[PDB]
């Protein structure tokens, strides 16, 4: 009759988190207020680096995000570097960084 | 008169302090520091700390700083020097990185 | 019959950049991203439900798994735009 | 670090209780032969940022299971999750 996701104003699936949060054995009992709130956070992060990769793709004059546009969209942001601290990105490359003591 | 070298020298104080295991920062000034940072992260509600918790920081905040000064002093023996500058504590926090202090 | 988040990433991207695509290896990342923020969060709200010796992961314990995990200013907005989606779900 | 006093003169401040010869006795344990005169501003800069990444996790573990008493079982958990397991009290 209605998706729960439409009732929350979200886009990530409410129930698919909820079915994973039960079949994962994180606890014996699972609240019904929880996977709304967990599918609401997980929207906000994947709407956050894709905004930052969105700007970084126009600056490289392309219109399709390749993985190098995520590696630049995290590492050129403070709070996402700390979140993705020990995380490498396949086909990632590095930042453009020269030592500033060369000439 | 009988003037020695520099309380000759430092080297008695190193081998006396690496021998023992007691705490090095005075408990009451450290207890005023921990209760002041704890009033910032709380929106004003001043928390009671247990007497066992203000040992549970100071046993880490020493044993992190003591390890940082060992792990920085391998750079001032690297730079030809002996004296430890801030240019090295600033660098030991940049080579472990995000796990030696944000 | 394997499932994924890849429809849901590609629906959010049309909402913040109406004209930009995303290649099929970058979608292969945004899976293994959001299959990992989900595991750090709900794998640590499982731990607060054992320290307090409760038994139900409520919505309150996803809140103080976010306030530990996400650093900086990224926490005060995830907890912001999180509870805005709960005061909509109840009052409906 | 917000304070609303307006008198243009204060205490040591509050951090200047980790003295000069205390920071020495830390480093002398580490095998530092000889310190600069500028570490004494640096190390208090580090020790201010070490507690803020422990007390921000201790004061949430406390505030969750609704209390006002930051025990030693939080500060062990705030170091265990952080990456530094402490085997004294937990």
């Amino acid at each position: 009759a209605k998706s729960r996701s439409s009732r929350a104003g979200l886009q990530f699936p409410v129930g698919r988190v909820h079915r994973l949060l039960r079949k994962g054995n994180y606890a014996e009992r699972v609240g019904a207020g929880a996977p709304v709130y967990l599918a609401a956070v997980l929207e906000y992060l994947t709407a956050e680096i894709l905004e930052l990769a969105g700007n970084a793709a126009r600056d490289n004059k392309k219109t399709r995000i390749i993985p190098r546009h995520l590696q630049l969209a995290i590492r050129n942001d403070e709070e996402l570097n700390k979140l993705l601290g020990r995380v490498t990105i396949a086909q990632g490359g590095v930042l453009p960084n020269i030592q500033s003591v060369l000439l | 008169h009988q003037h020695s070298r520099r309380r000759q020298g430092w080297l008695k104080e190193i081998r006396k302090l690496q021998k023992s295991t007691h705490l090095l920062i005075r408990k009451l000034p450290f207890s005023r520091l921990a209760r002041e940072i704890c009033v910032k992260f709380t929106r004003g509600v001043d928390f009671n700390w247990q007497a066992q918790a203000l040992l549970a920081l100071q046993e880490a905040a020493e044993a992190f700083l003591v390890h940082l000064f060992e792990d920085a002093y391998l750079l001032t023996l690297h730079a030809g020097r002996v004296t430890l500058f801030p240019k090295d504590v600033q660098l030991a926090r940049r080579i472990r990185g995000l796990e030696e202090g944000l | 019959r394997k499932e994924s988040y890849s429809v849901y990433v590609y629906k959010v991207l049309k909402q913040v950049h109406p004209d930009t695509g995303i290649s099929s290896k970058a979608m292969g990342i945004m899976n293994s991203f959001v299959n990992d923020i989900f595991e750090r969060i709900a794998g640590e709200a499982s731990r607060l439900a054992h320290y307090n010796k409760r038994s139900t992961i409520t919505s309150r314990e996803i809140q103080t798994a976010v306030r530990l995990l996400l650093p900086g200013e990224l926490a005060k907005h995830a907890v912001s735009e999180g509870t805005k989606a709960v005061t909509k779900y109840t009052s409906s | 670090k917000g304070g609303a006093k307006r008198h243009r003169k204060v205490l040591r401040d509050n951090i200047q209780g980790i003295t000069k010869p205390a920071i020495r006795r830390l480093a002398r344990r580490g095998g530092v032969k000889r310190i600069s005169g500028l570490i004494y501003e640096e190390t208090r800069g580090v020790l201010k940022v070490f507690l803020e990444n422990v007390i921000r996790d201790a004061v949430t573990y406390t505030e969750h299971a609704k209390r006002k008493t930051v025990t030693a079982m939080d500060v062990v958990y705030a170091l265990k999750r952080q990456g530094r397991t402490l085997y004294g009290f937990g």
Binding site: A47, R75 | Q90, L91, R93, R94 | - | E41, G45
Partner: peptide
């Protein structure tokens, strides 16, 4: 879709008090 203040890698490790 609002923002936080995304600055830079925004240098650290040389850090001082705001004086």
């Amino acid at each position: 879709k609002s923002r936080r203040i995304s600055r830079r890698p925004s240098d650290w490790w040389v850090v001082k008090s705001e004086e």
